[PDB]
UniProtKB/TrEMBL annotation:
Record-annotated EF-hand domain positions: 4-39, 41-76, 78-113, 114-149
InterPro entries: Centrin_CML-like, EF-hand-dom_pair, EF_Hand_1_Ca_BS, EF_hand_dom
SMART domains given in the database record: EFh (SM00054)
GO biological process, alphabetically ordered: microtubule cytoskeleton organization; regulation of mitotic cytokinesis; regulation of nuclear division
GO MF annotation list: calcium ion binding
Gene3D superfamilies: EF-hand
Record-given protein name: Centrin, putative
Keywords, ordered alphabetically: Calcium, Repeat
Domain of life: Eukaryota
A family per Pfam: EF-hand_7
Amino acid sequence: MAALTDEQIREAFNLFDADGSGAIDAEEMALAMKGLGFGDLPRDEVERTVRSMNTNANGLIEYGEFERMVKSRMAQKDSPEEVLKAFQLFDLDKKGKISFANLKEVAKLLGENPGDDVLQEMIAEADEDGDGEVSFEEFKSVMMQMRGK
């Protein structure tokens, strides 16, 4: 019915819009994040997010493209338990050795159209585990570490 992600994006857009302005700039986004003291991302994440959402650098951000983008990147990510069970079923064991190609095919087969940046970045991170290998164990571990810390 409803996923946590939905509530997250909903509250976010609600706060940003709360300003009562026709549009929200980067300065406002940073100020809000700081005030809440939660969800503090790096500068690179801010510039990247703005670039993706705002295709045309005109010093303004659209609400439609903003929510649309956020939902796109969020669509790729899923709950911790959901992903856990999914992997367990896909593989009873934990070899952590799977060709990136196979993973891509499976993703596209699911009907998901994530951002290219998420694909290259994902493989890059998982690749750190070894040399040309994709270990889901690494990703999962990272997610858990973040949730806790």
